[PDB]
From a paper:
VLRs are featured with a LRR domain of multiple LRR modules and an invariant stalk region rich in threonine and proline residues2. Jawless vertebrate AIS employs VLRs as antigen receptors to recognize invaded pathogens, such as viruses and bacteria. In summary, we identified [name] from [name] as an analog of variable lymphocyte receptor VLRC using bioinformatics analysis and structural comparison combined with in vitro bacterial binding assays. This is the first characterized VLR-like protein in amphioxus, suggesting the emergence of VLR-based AIS in basal chordates.
We applied both the recombinant [name] and Bf289081 to crystallization trials; however, only the crystal structure of [name] was successfully determined at a resolution of 1.79 Å in the space group P212121. Each asymmetric unit contains two molecules with a total buried interface area of 567 Å2, which is not sufficient to maintain a stable dimer. In fact, gel-filtration chromatography also indicated that [name] exists as a monomer in solution. The overall structure of [name] (residues Cys21–Asp202) adopts a crescent-shaped solenoid conformation, rich of conserved leucine and isoleucine residues involved in formation of the hydrophobic core, which is typical for the LRR family. The structure contains a 36-residue LRRNT, an 18-residue LRR1, two 24-residue LRRVs (LRRV1 and LRRVe), a 20-residue CP and a 51-residue LRRCT. The inner concave surface of [name] is formed by a β-sheet made up of six β-strands (β1, β2, β3, β5, β7 and β8), with β1 anti-parallel to the remaining β-strands that are arranged in a parallel fashion. Notably, the 20-residue CP in [name] folds into an α-helix that shares no identity with the 13-residue CP of previously identified VLRs. Moreover, the N- and C-terminal caps of [name] also have four strictly conserved disulfide bonds presumably important for the structural integrity: two within LRRNT (Cys21-Cys27, Cys25-Cys39) and the other two within LRRCT (Cys146-Cys171, Cys148-Cys192). Altogether, lamprey VLRA and VLRB possess an insertion in LRRCT, whereas [name] and lamprey VLRC possess a protruding loop in LRRNT, suggesting that [name] is more likely a putative VLRC rather than either VLRA or VLRB. Thus, we identified that the residues Asp105 and Asp107 at the concave are key to recognition of Gram-positive bacteria.
Author numbering: 21 to 194
The structure:
């Protein structure tokens, strides 16, 4: 168990790794392979990389709410086939890639279960890189929650809900 965390096994035999509110600037090393719930809420994390969850393929819940995350590698979740919930709410993300969620979505579908992504309260940049999520939300996706999903930029779209903006308003210049 990492020194900044508490690792406890539940009555159901599931290991919770609780590292909330510890001032962490990075994901801790040596989280045990048996980790099922990883709580990293209320820290100072800025980046999720391709290797942030290396060796943590049993994770069912990841709580990264209320950090300072401004980028997540599109490869970060590519081996997380048991993920039920990921919380990236209250961070500094301006975009997320569609490819980021492919594996947990596919795995959840194959396993007959729900995989939920909670992205509330990020400063979304509503250019052509976020049209995909805008449209999934507009369509009624069961994967991506639509609470507090609003554009920070560009100026014309500031304050508008992603799911209420037409596709042709999501524009990229050079």
């Amino acid at each position: 168990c990492p020194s900044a965390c508490k690792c406890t096994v539940s009555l159901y035999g599931e290991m919770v790794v609780a590292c909330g509110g510890m001032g962490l600037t990075e994901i801790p090393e040596d989280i045990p392979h048996r980790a099922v719930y990883l709580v990293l809420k209320d820290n100072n994390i800025t980046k999720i990389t391709s290797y942030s969850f290396k060796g943590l393929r049993n994770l069912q819940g990841i709580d990264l709410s209320n950090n300072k995350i401004n980028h997540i590698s599109s490869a970060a979740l590519r081996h997380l086939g048991h993920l039920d919930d990921i919380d990236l709410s209250r961070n500094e993300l301006t975009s997320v890639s569609e490819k980021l969620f492919d594996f947990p979505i596919s795995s959840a579908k194959a396993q007959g279960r729900r995989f939920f992504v909670y992205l509330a309260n990020n400063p979304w940049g509503c250019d052509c890189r976020m049209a995909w999520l805008a449209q999934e939300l507009a369509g009624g996706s069961k994967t991506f929650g639509d609470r507090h999903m609003e554009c920070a930029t560009p100026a014309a779209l500031a304050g508008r809900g992603l799911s209420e903006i037409p596709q042709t308003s999501f524009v990229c210049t050079g």
